[PDB]
Amino acid sequence: ARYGATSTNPAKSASARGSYLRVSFKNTRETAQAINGWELTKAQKYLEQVLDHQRAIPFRRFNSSIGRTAQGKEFGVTKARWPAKSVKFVQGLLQNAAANAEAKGLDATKLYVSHIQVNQAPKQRRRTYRAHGRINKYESSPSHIELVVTEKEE
């Protein structure tokens, strides 16, 4: 419990989270922002399309010197990617949240991703060996991912 700041009704909302997930925090943040606020089924279809390379995740913050694609046109960007690992983790959490919403008795047809936040988990540290007998860090940047899906209301 104790998710990030949410402004929705907890009685019409269902949560999912995953901690210390060994997936790139930056890619996961971009993937999360890609579906932030979307309808649940639309976001899931979009993530499957991303895995199929039919649509892309627009990289908005962590995108220096990545590369350009035409599949960022629909998001008004030139820099988009297909972070399969991040997408798979986000689908796992989306499916978990959908299961929790089904258990709680929320309408799956009205579910949208009302909150999704990715922050940095503690780094897992390895070592890389550099010229002249040097040693540098080879750390992972894992992610805490959380999301809550809420029934849309009026």
Residues found near Mg ion in the complex (CB under 5 A):
129, 133
Return the one option of Mg ion, RNA, none that residue 136 interacts with (CB less than 5 to 8 A, by type): RNA
| Contacted by 109, from RNA, Mg ion, none: CB < 5 to 8 Å by type | none
Residue 109 or 128: which CB sits closer to RNA? Answer: 128
How is residue 62 annotated by DSSP?
A: S
The residue behind tokens 């350009």 is 68
Smallest gap from residue 137 Cβ to Mg ion (A)? 13
Q: CB–CB of 39/109 below 8 Å?
A: no
Least distance from Mg ion to the Cβ atom of residue 8, Å: 26
Contact criterion met (CB below 8 Å) for 29 and 80: no
Q: How far is the CB of 97 from RNA (least distance, A)?
A: 7
Tell me how far, at minimum, the Cβ of 21 lies from Mg ion, in Å.
13
Structure tokens at 107: 């309408």
Partner whose footprint covers residue 150, from RNA, Mg ion, none (CB < 5 to 8 Å by kind): none
| Number of Cβ within a 10 Å radius of residue 9 | 11
Whichever of 45 and 122 has its CB closer to RNA, that residue is: 122
Of the two residues 103 and 136, which places its CB atom closer to Mg ion in the complex?
A: 136
Sequence-separated (6 or more) residues with CB below 8 Å from residue 53: 82
Q: Whole-angstrom distance between the N-terminal and C-terminal Cα of the chain?
A: 27
- Distance (Å, rounded) from C-alpha 83 to C-alpha 151? 28
What residue 82 binds from Mg ion, RNA, none (CB within 5 to 8 A, per partner kind)? RNA
Residue 124 DSSP class = P
Q: Which residue, 82 or 112, has its beta carbon nearer to RNA?
A: 82
